[PDB]
């Protein structure tokens, strides 16, 4: 029943009593369900230190994993150039699924083609979808560029994209003079990350390879910035301007801000802003490259040396103070722009705010996960609050980011609790979270379950989740938020103290039990 | 009315096209007529996409393991393959059921083999056999197993029958291998047509030889039903008000016994034609069971479904029927009266797959709205010949339809509001005009039964009248 | 009892058995406390409607106000010029309040001085006191300007300030050419927004009222903004920010925005920025004057329309979409400078915000309570989104301000369910949120409590509270966030969003009970 | 060290003074000498501040309402006059109780009396007894009354006297009227004593006809323990220890029944002499109770102050008390272990208002930390007194210290840490010097007693060591 002037979504609809009852009934007469006192034991024996080593134990088993496939992160990246189509080379189903990732995500408009190739293409290939993909979509969506990534169904039945874009150029499918990179990301190698950078590679190499005879370094007087897979708005913005208040003459490669962040003004935008072709066929003439996520632009960084002769710098992160200021000093070194008063006063504010919250972050325990680069800036930011990270997970890290992660972690003492996974899903995760409880965890939507499984052990078991990172699907608009520079850096100190005060608060709102802490002032 | 405006516009908007995909698409375009029956003569179906128009298709992977095979809660479904599948299907479907996740329950989890490039060059049946001894150590409570293929399980020489049956009799449990390769089919309907074969290859025939259940002549059993947002709730619940037993709903809240326990019902009430369809044939075939289909969408199909269904049953059953809906008749009136006053006379173009297009007109009407333009994902014929009954007079039907041809018919036809996925909720925000998703119906509902239409209505009234829509126009410009 | 591994402080070492055996044992031997049934039986009377209709039959008793004194509204005003030390004539006990209130508030240092007038000025008067505390402050902190404010002593004492600063220049205590402005702040009229327009309104005659006779209106192309009585740096900024945009020249009078946010890099900064002398002198110059909150700025703006013979626009403040509209479009006519595309495309973006969270905003039930401008500036913007205000409290509101409320209500449907009351205090709004209980709470630190007393009634009556105005107590850094223009209509609807998802995330928590509406996406 | 340093630095602090300011000033800071023994032939306190010098000392109502009276729980305290004083006096200071807020106790409610204009002019005698009315009218549980007068009180001859005396007998109430007038005195030190005299003349001898309380000869009294954070608490449990029963808690967690009670108890252990000597002379005079001050600051005090109050019992209180101090010696033992190699050699400054100053040294010195200077904003010569055996030679000594001379002071000596109040904490740390409040303990705590020892040194630790001072220096200057 429902009364028409409040009426009830399923929450909280489905707790009256006819449906209860309802439920109960379907429970007992047909779905053969286990007793409650079994289900409980094993949810317990799965909270314990035996179930864990158990878990530890797999081998073949991946049970709710923190990565994505390569084509998506290809896509991302060729979301960042001007006018440009993403198309994906394969089936279509996939790129279904990273349209509405991508949407879930952002809540913008996300704009992807495929060939739609099917069991006719697994035996014959793809020759005649690509031909006909790449006429159909430039005839119908208008793009300036069209950046192909592929499918695993296009991999593993070996198709070539080079011979297939050259022959589909010959046989006037598409004008000859007309930009197509290509870039294999096949899904069983890496991540998605490791897809936006192939499909970076690939468009640098399609523009910069053949016209490095008359490229002189440092000709025009910028420095390149290469940001990697980044899906927060607010880290191109503070870049951007953090290099303009500098006086810094840059260019952003793979920009998506724009597209990204379109106004709702009566019309649709399928492109708007972008690195430009003559940014990318300019770039080589820079003084050098400042690669944002090292750890996942091995590729570009390789070609970026290789061909434009820069010496890219070994740079960290620029999260948190320190990694940010070298990041600032670098660039003030390789530009000769001297770093201006503006950013001295942002650096002290960050300090400041440091200085206000340390009394409260002060031996807080922390889980973690997420991309690489993004795990290990955020530990070494938590290091420099007096945080106490205890399990660091990243799924899509190898051996090489896990040394290095230790390394930083030896140079402080508050790393002496701390263990780096590698290869860990997020299962491992709930078993590390029950038997050695952290005080919050910090990573994407994907958390929240395992929250839900704290709370149902208790209210003094709960694990609090802390949405930093990608995707973000139960919140809104936090894609439009900072972890870059000092200002990324203000908002998750911002962000990690309100969440500490108010857990403090939900600990102590009970009258006359515990509300004696209640205080008005913290 | 304007029969020839709407074959202008279809011609002006297929004139970007290339020659061959011009050819193709002018065939999945039509104007209604409501006297046509056979819609073969008018709009074609079931055909593959146009390389590069951007489709809004999914794979046969999505239509089994997404559909079908997901909402069973106390079985594990295995996503075989790379990582990318299960990761973007997990929990984006709102297929609503009751249990201890993790425990008993796993419909929200992600299980994937996780190939890498070792497991694509020498397979991955080891690999698999071992994933399977790892799902039983860790997960003892689960009551059966789901092997959903990917891409590569197809492409590459992977055997994965043989692997399911020497472990399902090595663990004595039931071990299903789904071949549902996203490069089979055109779109998500051939993996419908995969998953109920496995169904009745491997999970509906274990209680033939059993007659321990008590049957009495009122079984029904719900098929084509996946509790989106709560909906079965919302129809079970109605039909156990009208004095019947619903053994078995398909599949959301679903369970292995439910669908084991199915052969013994006296009737299946099917709700999605396009995707159980097979099944419900099947049973008909093999066990002499009547299935029938319903509508649960607005007050107006409810009361018909409920009458015809009572129909198929004694007189007790009739007098029941006649009870609940005098029980809900004032309910639904009071939303209507409050409701139609400020939907009265608004436009409506829906792009849904399968069942939902001309499957919510009723409820639109009944807040006396009207859909101007209809169009599926991936229907067949016989649901055009359902929908051309359904629809008005010189209305717009459209299957496959493009971006390209969805927005430009969007911005001449000019709707109130439109019906539509995610793909497509954003763009025509940024556009000026209200938009509902139908699919996750905008994280709200249920919207089947009594209760699921003043869901509907109030969230229909919510975002058609909202005051943003009045500000997207700067004072200054 | 103490684990050295791990130290609890007093939330929960309290809970301890022994420390529960040892309040039981107090309270049941010599507290003589009421019955615990007792106690139940009156608080659950409390919360009924017969309790409401005798609180608001209240006549003298206040409990739990919403506004503070006039003096601490004049210091904030004269914080906001440059090397300027705020004095206040009276006794040293309100300056200690007022440091201590906007330390906990700012979180940062905060100046002023006293007299310290004492019983025998109590009898003879505040001259003595006057000279030698403005003598002692010129030669101690050396500031370049002192601005004077009263304590309700001296206003009942009636003390001279213009009497007492002329015999004090002419005795020699400071030089002739030394800015003494001051202004009566009695407490015991209005509120600390009241003390903020009579210490304006001080300075801006003694800067110029004397020199009126060069002064042309607009020969210097300038639009003087005075932002009135803010606590949010963030509304300086974007006020700046805008203005500086639209290619405006603009003089922030009373701008507070430096000396609040001083970095920490090794010194105290006493003083820093704030509006020049000079741009007080210059002010009558401008080609008009635009008041930020004109509901708390009538004395200003009788001075500004009479003295400077600017015609002062009738604006609202710039809050919500339509009054940010509308204030951008009289800067733009009376600046005659057009409104850029960077401007148009934010207002777009917040659009597109709007149109995302729709869904979720719609219907929501919000008792909130500050001070007047922003009061109706969030009520505007409330009903922007959709949203049913149904408890306004403004308790330093008038009855203009209510007949203005009411008729901006009445122009919205979703308006109908609302109240506004003016003079009434949190004890009253208690009542209101018992009786007829709303979604959220949108106002200072002090609702805290009325959440807790709405938990001890059932996790159902439970209303949360949003942490928006003044002051803010118990969370770090949100003094630092923006609710003027674009900005911050952004950062309000992105909280108000969120906080409606984390409640909805919390009540769908329970597993197997309501998790099934525990979604992954929102 | 070096005195004759310590002095030629007053005096170029003192330089920038004017004549009248620099010969007052001159007076209140000093060089310590702990042989000397009389504070008064080296300091001067208790006196007018000098005006426009930024003073730290509060007002009378400050020292009564906000000290004394306002932690009594059960009764309520209306803050008589306009509307700031007890609006920036809400719930600022951590007097910790338990109660049912609102309905019994009222620690953290502001209640007053919001004069206009009206009020001023006509008086507010009437508005008060009205209001008296009121409260009784929607608190039916309070237990008593007290009107805390504010300045215009007392500056327009309001009679609260009578008014509460006509009340009192009319609803046989309980009201204690206060002239804490913040013009009174010159700090809050003169608020402790009237807040002392009003309860000695209201509220202490309204039990002295009854004799039906049961009374032991352990029965002790906790005098000037205001609970902050739980320090009461964590005290008494230690006095429960060793055998004794305490009656009543002064006043933190404390109720108007205790103070009723107090006169029957067998000892006044006192911890704050500055607030509550008064009484406690007042007691021994009337009742012939003794009274004796304890410090429950570090475990070497709290072991003294232990030993010293069971000197005054017999032997088995004796015992018990040794019994208590084996007990905890492992775990403050493993505090010292784990906290004083992290401490040892540092320097602190203090500068809190009575008493603290002198009782937290013990536990800096028992963390291995020195205190090279001290002093107070409203001590007497008898603070100083007892203050300057307990400080090391050649020291710093102040009195009502201005800002611009705490700043001077702090940059000369340089101090490794600061402990001071609200309006010194974000000065200090712009600075680069770690501060720690000693008013509030950083919003943590409790420090009194061997539970509190672990929580002081965990604080001083995490502040002192904090990684966040090693990065104020930007690394490009
Ligand atoms: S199964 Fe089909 S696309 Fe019939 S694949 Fe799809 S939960 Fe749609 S119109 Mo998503 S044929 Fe169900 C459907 Fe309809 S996933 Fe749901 S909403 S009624
Ligand atoms: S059509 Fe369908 S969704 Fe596509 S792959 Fe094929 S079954 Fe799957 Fe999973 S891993 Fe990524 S998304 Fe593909 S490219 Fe290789
Ligand atoms: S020394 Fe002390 S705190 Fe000062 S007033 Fe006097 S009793 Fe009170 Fe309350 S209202 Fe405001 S703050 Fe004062 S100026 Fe009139
Ligand atoms: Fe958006
Ligand atoms: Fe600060």
Known sequence: ?522 | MSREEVESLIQEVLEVYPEKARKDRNKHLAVNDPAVTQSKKCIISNKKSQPGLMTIRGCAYAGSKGVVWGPIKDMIHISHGPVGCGQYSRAGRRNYYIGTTGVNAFVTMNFTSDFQEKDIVFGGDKKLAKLIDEVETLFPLNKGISVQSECPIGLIGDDIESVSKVKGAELSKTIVPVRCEGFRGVSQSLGHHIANDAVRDWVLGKRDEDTTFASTPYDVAIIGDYNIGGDAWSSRILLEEMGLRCVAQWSGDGSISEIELTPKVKLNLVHCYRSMNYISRHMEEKYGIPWMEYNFFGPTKTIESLRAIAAKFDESIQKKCEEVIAKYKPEWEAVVAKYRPRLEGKRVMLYIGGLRPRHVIGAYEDLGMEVVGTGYEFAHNDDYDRTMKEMGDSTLLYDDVTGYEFEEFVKRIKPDLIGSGIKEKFIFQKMGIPFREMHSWDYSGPYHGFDGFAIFARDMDMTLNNPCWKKLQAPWE
């Open chain 1, 1 to 522: 029943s429902q009364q028409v002037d409040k009426i009830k979504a399923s929450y909280p609809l489905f707790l009256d009593q006819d449906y209860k009852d309802m439920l109960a009934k379907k429970r007992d007469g047909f779905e053969e369900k286990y007793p409650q006192d079994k289900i409980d034991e094993v949810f317990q024996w799965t909270t314990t230190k035996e179930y864990q080593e158990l878990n530890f134990q797999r081998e073949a088993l991946t049970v709710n994993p923190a990565k994505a496939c390569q084509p998506l992160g290809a896509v991302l990246c060729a979301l960042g150039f001007e006018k440009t189509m993403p198309y994906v080379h394969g089936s279509q189903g996939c790129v279904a699924y990273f349209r509405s990732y991508f949407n879930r995500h952002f809540r913008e408009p996300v704009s992807c083609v495929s060939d739609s190739m099917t069991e006719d293409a697994a035996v014959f290939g793809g020759q005649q979808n690509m031909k006909d993909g790449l006429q159909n979509c430039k005839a119908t969506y208008k793009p300036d560029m069209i950046a192909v990534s592929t499918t695993c169904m296009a991999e593993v039945i070996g198709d070539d994209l080079n011979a297939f874009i050259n022959n589909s150029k010959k046989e006037g499918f598409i004008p000859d003079e007309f930009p197509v990179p290509f870039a294999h990301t096949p899904s069983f190698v890496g991540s998605h990350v490791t897809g936006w950078d192939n499909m970076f590679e690939g468009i640098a190499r399609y523009f910069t390879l053949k016209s490095m005879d008359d490229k002189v370094v440092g000709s025009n007087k910028k420095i390149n910035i290469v940001p990697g897979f980044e899906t927060y708005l607010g880290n191109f913005r503070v870049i951007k301007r953090m290099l303009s208040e500098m006086g810094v003459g840059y260019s952003l490669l793979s920009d998506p801000e724009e597209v990204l962040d379109t106004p709702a003004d009566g019309q649709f935008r399928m492109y708007a802003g972008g690195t430009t072709q003559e940014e990318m066929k300019d770039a080589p003439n820079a003084l050098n490259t400042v690669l944002l996520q090292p750890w996942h632009l091995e590729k570009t960084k390789k070609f970026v040396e290789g061909t434009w002769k820069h010496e890219v710098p070994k740079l960290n992160i620029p999260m948190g103070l320190d990694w940010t200021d070298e990041f600032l000093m670098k660039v003030s070194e390789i530009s000769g722009q001297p770093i201006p008063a503006s950013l001295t006063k942002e650096r002290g504010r960050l300090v400041d705010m440091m200085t206000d919250s340390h009394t409260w972050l002060h031996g807080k325990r922390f889980a973690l996960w997420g991309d690489p680069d993004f795990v290990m800036g955020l530990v070494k930011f938590l290091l420099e609050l007096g945080c106490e990270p205890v399990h660091i997970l990243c799924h899509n890290g190898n051996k090489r980011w896990k040394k290095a992660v230790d390394a930083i972690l030896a140079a402080s003492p508050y790393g002496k609790n701390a263990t780096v996974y590698i290869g860990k899903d997020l299962w491992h995760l709930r078993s590390l979270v029950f038997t050695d409880k952290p005080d919050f965890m910090i990573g994407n939507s994907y958390g929240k379950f395992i929250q839900r499984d704290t709370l149902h052990k208790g209210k003094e078991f709960e694990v609090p989740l802390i949405r930093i990172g990608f995707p973000i699907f139960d919140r809104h608009h936090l894609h439009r938020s900072t972890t870059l520079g000092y200002e990324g850096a203000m908002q998750i100190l911002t962000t990690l103290v309100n969440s500490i005060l108010e857990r403090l608060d939900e600990e102590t709102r009970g009258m006359q039990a515990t509300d004696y802490n209640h205080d008005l002032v913290r």
